[PDB]
Structure formats: structure tokens, C-alpha cells
């Protein structure tokens, strides 16, 4: 049975009762216990706000993307919000339980699969630059300043992904990638990662 | 599943959405696709949601009424909007005889295209019928729809003192709109002598 959807009086119904997304079809509606359900990737069109979906962690973000950060063991270490600004994305990060000192902090190219930080790949580098904000041949769009962790093991910071975008399908789109916190300090000059070393925490940027 | 709104956690305590006086899972996985309740996400952005069973329509932001004739053909559509003075109705209809047609909010939903089942005019303030009656009027009383030679109505009208707020005396949610065969004379109890019911639709809730 066809369910119809109107938004402020305008028809948003699908033509055949199917929702299409990245070359897959799904029924556009399920009714269960009297409640109407729609696919997660359809519900932006119905609520007039961007809807971000992190499939492996089953996290929906409305408005601002949320990044949940985990250690290698799958335990929560903190979170971050992203917000689009002029020619960048503003990252507001909270983290706890990290070793005091400076930690390398970057957007990596790939999503983390199965909680294995090696799967994140290298730094997000759509402009084909060398690593480092202090490098004359820098920098990766993914490069941020070190996360400064206190004696208490905590960090709170606002970093900018310079030239990053939350818009979909753009060379500098940071949606559907990852944030990685390193064990070591980023020296701001050395390829590929500022001599940042191991990946101690990370999380997926929804899309 | 987890829900965040502009960065704050809005997740449910136990994975259940409270709706319709029952619980539904705050998500459903069907054949590799994650479904979420339209009402939970719309509620999180502050956008109202309404449902109408006969038309199987979800109305987001403002109610849409689908109008049908006795044969069950779609003959038009109305949007309802909350205003200071009541509820604004913007209506389009086709298939009507040229001339003036009575147009009212009736007290009940239409049960399966039986327009009699809509009952009388919505009358929460216990007045007489008619916008020209010194003892009027029903909250459900609107002016006549003027239908051209083409059989088409297009009008903007106010349900005076009506409301889309829930659980108020003058709530029009879950009632009906009826278009009559005849002209509403604006005076005669109980329906202005507007005669038969020729089209109608249920107001979402
Ligand atoms: Cu890195
Ligand atoms: Cu009537
Ligand atoms: Zn880099
Ligand atoms: Zn009346």
C-alpha cells in the first residue's frame, strides 16, 4: 500500500513506493506497531535538516556531524562535532584517558573498518600536498595541530580542517572518513604523518 | 542506535520510541536497510507530523487533506495552517458543478466514503449554522466554494477559532471537510440548505 509524504503541503512521495540510494532500492515505508518508518538516508528530505549516518556505529547526527572516538579496544575515549565554516570545517573535540603531551591529530582518508585503525589509510590529501602545517610544501587537508593532552589525560580543543567541506561529492568532502589521534607528537614537517607514530584512538565521520 | 541533535545526545534509554500509547523500536533493520520512525526524527527537529489513514498520508509541517468523490476518485486537496484567527484552509477541487457549493468542517472522520458518517457541522461553541446568521456560526462553517465553468474550485478560507493544537475544544484534527451539491444560504440551521455531500476528506491527526 502506497504511503504518501507531504512537507509543508508539497508532495515528497516516491513515484513507485521505493527509495533509491547509491544504486540500491528499498521499500520507502514500513509500518510497525502503528509507527511509520522510513530509510535513514530518506529522512533528510522529510525533515529539512541534513541527516548524517554512521552505519557501523548505528549513529544518526542531525544538524552537525558527531564523531565518536574509541581506543584500539573499542572503548569510548571522547567525541567531536564538525561544523562547516568559510573554507574549512571546525572540529570541537573532547577526549579523556590519553597520555600527557602532544598527539598528532588528522583526518584520514578511509573509514575505520572493524575498529582496526590501519584501515583508515593515510591522511586525507585531496590537494596532493606534503604533510605538515609548518611544511612549505604542506599541507594535507586532513592536517590539524597537535591535540594537547594535560597531566589529567584530558583534551578539549577547536581545530580547523582547512579547506575541508561537509558538502557531499566534493574533492574536499570529509564525510565518510575518519579522525585519528596518534601516540606521538606531529612534528609538522615530516612525511607522511609528522613522525606521529601509532594510532591510539579514532572514529568515523558519518555521511 | 544513537541520535545526536546539533551535538547533544537525544538517544532513547532502552531503544524504544513511545508512540500511539505503545512502544516501537527506535530503529528497524529490514533486508540490510536501517529504518527510523518518521515521527521521532521529525519531533527531534521540531516539525509537526500528522497521519491520515484513508489516504495513507503522512503530513509533515502542516496537515494536507485529500478530497474524494462518492466514487473514490481524488478530486483535490487542502492544506491547513494555524493562524491567529483559527485555521487557514487553502483548497483546490475538480469535478464540481459550476456555481456555489457549501463547504464545512464536519464533526467526524468519513468512514469508507460514506459522507453521512461525517455527522453534522463541527460545532464546539454550540452556535446555529451560518456566517450571515446573527445566532451563528459553527466553527466548521466556511464560505461557499465558487466553482467556474471548468468545474474547478480554488479558495483560501478560515475556520474561525479552529485550532490544530491537540486536545482543545476547537481542535479540527481527526475531523473532515465536506463539499456539498448545493449553495450554503449562510442562515438556515443546520447546514444552510446546502443539500447532498458530493466530496470530502479526512483531516489528519
Ligand atoms: Cu593521522
Ligand atoms: Cu457540510
Ligand atoms: Zn598529514
Ligand atoms: Zn454549519
Numbering used by the authors:
A (entry chain A): 14 to 220
B (entry chain B): 16 to 220
In the authors' words:
pmcMost aerobes ranging from prokaryotes to eukaryotes are equipped with Cu/Zn-superoxide dismutase (CuZnSOD), which facilitates the disproportionation of superoxide into hydrogen peroxide and molecular oxygen. In order to become an active enzyme, CuZnSOD primarily needs to bind a copper ion at the copper-binding site because it functions as the active center for the disproportionation of superoxide. A structural significance of the S–S bond in CuZnSOD is to tether a loop to the protein core and thereby shape an entry site of the substrate O2− leading to the catalytic copper ion. Here, we found that a CuZnSOD protein in Paenibacillus lautus (PaSOD) has no Cys residue but exhibits a significant level of enzyme activity.
In contrast, we successfully solved the crystal structures of PaSOD-1 by the single-wavelength anomalous diffraction method using wavelengths of Cu and Zn absorption edges at 1.50 Å and 1.45 Å resolution, respectively. We used the structure from data collected at a wavelength of Zn absorption edge (1.275 Å) to discuss the PaSOD-1 structure unless otherwise noted. Furthermore, PaSOD was found to form a homodimer through the N-terminal domain with a novel protein fold. Furthermore, the α-helices from each of the subunits are held together by a hydrophobic cluster made of valine residues (V100, V102, V105, and V109) and thereby form an intersubunit two-helix bundle (right). PaSOD-1CTD assumes an immunoglobulin-like fold commonly observed for CuZnSOD, which is mainly composed of eight β-strands. PaSOD-1CTD was found to bind a copper and zinc ion, the positions of which were determined based upon the anomalous scattering data collected at wavelengths 1.373 Å (Cu signal) and 1.275 Å (Cu and Zn signals). Their binding sites are almost overlapped with those in hSOD1 and EcSodC; a copper ion in PaSOD-1CTD is ligated through His168, His170, His185, and His244, whereas a zinc ion through His185, His193, His202, and Asp205. His185 is a so-called bridging ligand binding both a copper and zinc ion. Reduction of the S–S bond is known to significantly decrease the conformational stability of both hSOD1 (21) and EcSodC; therefore, we wondered how PaSOD-1 lacking the S–S bond maintains the interaction between loop IV and the β8 strand. When we looked on loop IV–β8 strand interaction from the direction pointed by a red arrow in Figure 6, A and B, the S–S bond in hSOD1 was found to be replaced with a phenyl group of Phe179 and a hydrogen of Gly264 in PaSOD-1. Moreover, Asp52 in loop IV of hSOD1 points outward but is replaced with Ile174 pointing inward in PaSOD-1, where a hydrophobic cluster (Ile174, Gly176, Gly177, Phe179, Gly264, and Gly265) is formed between loop IV and β8 strand. Another notable feature in PaSOD-1 is that the side chain carbonyl and amide groups of Asn266 form hydrogen bonds with the main chain amide and carbonyl group of Ile174, respectively, whereas these hydrogen bonding interactions are missing in hSOD1.
